[PDB]
Amino acid sequence: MRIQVNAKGAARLLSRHLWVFRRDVVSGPETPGLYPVYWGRRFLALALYNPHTDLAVRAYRFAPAEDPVAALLENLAQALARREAVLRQDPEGGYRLVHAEGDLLPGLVVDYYAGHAVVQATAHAWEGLLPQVAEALRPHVQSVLAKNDARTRELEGLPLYVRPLLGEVPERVQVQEGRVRYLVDLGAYLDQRENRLYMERFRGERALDVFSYAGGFALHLALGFREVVAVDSSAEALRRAEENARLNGLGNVRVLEANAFDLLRRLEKEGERFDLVVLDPPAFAKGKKDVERAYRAYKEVNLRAIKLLKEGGILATASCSHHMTEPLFYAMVAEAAQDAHRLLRVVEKRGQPFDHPVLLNHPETHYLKFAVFQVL
Amino acid sequence: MRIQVNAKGAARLLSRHLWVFRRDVVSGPETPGLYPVYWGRRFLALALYNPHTDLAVRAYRFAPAEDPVAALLENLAQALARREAVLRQDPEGGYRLVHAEGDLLPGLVVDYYAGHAVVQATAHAWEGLLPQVAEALRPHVQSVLAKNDARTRELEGLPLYVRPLLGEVPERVQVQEGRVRYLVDLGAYLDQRENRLYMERFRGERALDVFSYAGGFALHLALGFREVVAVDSSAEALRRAEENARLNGLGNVRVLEANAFDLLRRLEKEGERFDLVVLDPPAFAKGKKDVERAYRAYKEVNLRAIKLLKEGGILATASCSHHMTEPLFYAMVAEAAQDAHRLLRVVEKRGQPFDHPVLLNHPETHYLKFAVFQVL
Ligand SMILES: Nc1ncnc2c1ncn2[C@@H]1O[C@H](CSCC[C@H](N)C(=O)O)[C@@H](O)[C@H]1O
Ligand SMILES: Nc1ncnc2c1ncn2[C@@H]1O[C@H](CSCC[C@H](N)C(=O)O)[C@@H](O)[C@H]1O
């Protein structure tokens, strides 16, 4: 079987982007699987293919190989390899083992929560290879969970479920993130792992960790701040926080359930002023249409946090959405510091950690933005 | 005396940008100096003012102070302070003491080359304060040179010259940059200091440091690469390189005078292939008009270096021009890796070191872009 694509799709794969959408496909196999892609009789790549989706082709190799399935399971080896050296030098931390496209393993995500792996396939061809994927994980895991309930799997013609693929997987587990530890529900945002560690270098009296979830940022901040106030919407989240709090021996970490948009503008009126504020909200946009409205949401919250800071305070602001490009994200923060009539010096601009790889030729692998500013 | 500005200029200073151009000024003192700025009878800031230039106002304080000259010399203290802690923990390295606008000291630049300071005033009001500036520098320098030959000083109505402002300043001096040392002509690009140190983590056979000047990158690379080949135009530059080379005890550092644009496309034909390439060209654009042509220049050289790399090699590419914004710079590198049909993974994205501060509300303080990619 061969996948044929037009001149547009051919150029995309030659520029090294991995996706070819349906409208640029001419002919393709009858069923989902691993097939080679051509532009006439010129080989372009090997790929994960689905004939029933707008995103039809997902390249994982740009050179012909004897066995397409071997080549794939090969990328998985080299992807697990790039980690290991770190997996044995900190077997208790939380790291990503496979970051889909970024590791040339499209539609596959596999996270490591200190021994207990969690696989996540979202491309049809993977579903049947879950047993091989698990085989490569045993030399490092104590178990493997298949969390395939993603609503995204429905577009692929895949069933929604969740269940073990090796050993026995607990209900939860603790992760050693630097000088602190946290729990995961076999919940954890490994993307901000190294940015949370960055925050340990700051000292001060009051710190306000907004959109904190389980208080990942608060635990690190509690080590250098008199008081820390983790804020969130889901009461279930703040709870995991208090739990992570005591588990570390931290008393200076009071939580506070509420809607950040009301809590902030309010704290500004009551005269509340902090030494460091961390903002780490969620997408605010599911589609290219939310970009406009999302921009305002992000702006408000940042404008507000800036006003809550004392002269000299630190602002750590972030975004994880693929709809909030980096130039936009930074434009917004400047729009916020502008309206606030406050001058922010740039402390540092960070992105995604090494275990969440980014491919230049494939923009969609780049979503995390993390910046640290000092108000003057 | 008071400086009056229209509604546009008033908004610029309220958004915390420091410049107000001539067309947004209503009334101002008869001669250059330090005056307060108002929008009607509403105080906006203190500033360095020149009535004969398009760039009329340069804010250095956004609050009224008893003594405008004291406030200025105060910013200078807090600017020298932010360094010192580092100046005593590495008294032999090269650091920037004053980065103009970024330190709220407009039109003033003062570099430290291991004890020997070099001041550079480009705003008229500073010229008469050079003696006070030098006073704040003695507690740290062995001398102070006034390199005021910048062609830019002519717009300000200032004379072009160069001469000592304290002690005796040598003809040259060595700087301790990490695990290597280099010479300066009382020549040195302190902006790339911390990016050169970053490069020490790489190992490999052949490394090609293009646009190297005195071989700052080559000296660091020689520590982990079999051979290193510093390239440049000015033969006088490569010479300082060989000198810096032997001074470190490095034999694996051959230089090569030539025009990078010819040398690269050529090396591609001769089949030359490297393990790491560093590109650190100059502006390529003096004005907003060169942006178009500059873009192509930057693109070519990057496209070429990418083709010279082996599968797995590292590319460290940079830009120091204020006309090549960051999104443009990264677009160009993607355009290059695209045309090259090579897939580049992002190793790291860095900017300017702490001693070359950037102000969010004032874009012109941000010019350095430094990125590291791994070809796959
Ligand atoms: N409108 C809203 N107001 C306040 N918090 C919200 C919100 N909408 C979502 N959130 C919370 O924002 C959080 C984003 S995830 C936070 C990640 C956390 N800092 C870590 O590093 O682990 C979620 O926990 C979510 O419950
Ligand atoms: N057309 C050209 N071809 C090759 N090199 C050039 C060039 N134009 C300018 N250069 C060289 O590019 C260099 C830019 S400065 C290099 C900085 C150096 N890497 C350091 O870290 O100290 C200068 O030394 C300049 O002489």
Distance CA A14, CA B295 (A): 22
Burial B13-32 (b: 16+ CB within 10 A, else e): bbbbbbbbeeebbeebeeeb
Nearest CA in chain B to A343: B16
In contact, A116 and A137? CB cutoff 8 Å: no
Dihedral of alpha carbons B287, B292, B296, B299, sign:
positive
Q: What residues in A contact B74, CB-CB < 8 Å?
A: none
Dihedral sign for Cα B83, B84, B89, B93, please: positive
- Are residues A357 and B344, on separate chains, in Cβ contact within 8 Å? no
Distance CA A270, CA B129 (A): 45
Residues of B in CB contact (< 8 Å) with A are 14-16, 62, 102, 104, 326-327, 333-334, 337-339, 341-346, 349, 351, 357-361, 366, 373, 376
Residue A302, both tokens: 């940042």
Collect all residues with Cβ–Cβ distance below 8 Å to B69 and sequence separation of at least 6. B34, B129
Interface test with B, best of A342, A361, A372 (most B CBs within 10 A): A361
Instruction: Kindly list the catalytic residues of B.
Output: 320
According to the entry, how was the structure determined? Answer: X-ray
Task: Name the one residue in this structure whose structure tokens are 């008893």.
Answer: B66
Residues in chain B within 8 Å Cβ distance of A344: 359-361
Contact between B162 and B120 (Cβ < 8 Å): no
Integer Cα distance of B214 and B231 in angstroms: 9
DSSP result, A51-120: TTSSEEEEEEESS--S-HHHHHHHHHHHHHHHHHTTTSSSTTSEEEEEEGGGGT-TTEEEEEETTEEEEE
Task: Quote the CA–CA distance of A361 and B334 in Å, as a whole number.
Answer: 6
What is the enclosing helix (H) or strand (E) of B245?
A: helix B235-246
Tell me which residue in B346, B361, B373 faces A343 most closely, judged by beta carbons: B361
Strand partners, A182: A175
User: In chain A, whose CA is at the least distance from the CA of B14?
Assistant: A341
**Which residues 6+ apart lie within 8 Å of A177 measured at CB?**
A93, A94, A193, A196, A197, A216, A219, A220
- Where residue B40 falls (left for φ over 0; alpha for ψ -120 to 50; beta otherwise) is left
Q: Is B262 buried (19+), middle (13-18) or exposed (0-12) by CB count in 10 A?
A: exposed
The structural domains of chain B, ordered by start, are: 1-66 (2.30.130.10), 67-171 (3.30.750.80), 172-376 (3.40.50.150)
Name the burial class of residue B131, with classes exposed (0-12), middle (13-18) and buried (19+) by CB atoms within 10 angstroms of its CB: exposed
- Which structure tokens are listed for A148? 């395939």
How many C-beta neighbours within 10 Å does residue A227 have?
A: 17
Contact between residue A174 and residue A181 where contact means Cβ atoms under 8 Å apart: yes
Residue B170 burial (C-beta neighbours within 10 Å; 0-12, 13-18, 19+):
middle
Q: What are the residues facing A112 on neighbouring strands?
A: A95, A117
DSSP readout, A283-307? -S-SSTTHHHHHHHHHHHHHHHHHH
The answer to whether the CB of B207 falls within 8 A of the CB of B278 is yes
Report the C-alpha gap between A297 and B288 in whole angstroms.
Answer: 34
| Amino acid at the residue A252 | N
- Choosing among B309, B342, B345, which should be mutated to test the A contact, i.e. which has the most A CBs within 10 A? B345
Virtual CA dihedral for B241, B246, B252, B254, nearest 10 degrees? 40
What lies within 8 Å, CB to CB, of B296 at 6+ separation is none
Supply B248's token pair: 């470190």
Beta carbons within 8 Å of A66's beta carbon, 6+ residues apart: none
Bridge partners for B341 per DSSP: none
Residue B180 has what DSSP assignment? Answer: E
Is A289 in contact with A349 (CB distance < 8 Å)?
Answer: no
Query: Is B247 buried (19+), middle (13-18) or exposed (0-12) by CB count in 10 A?
Result: middle
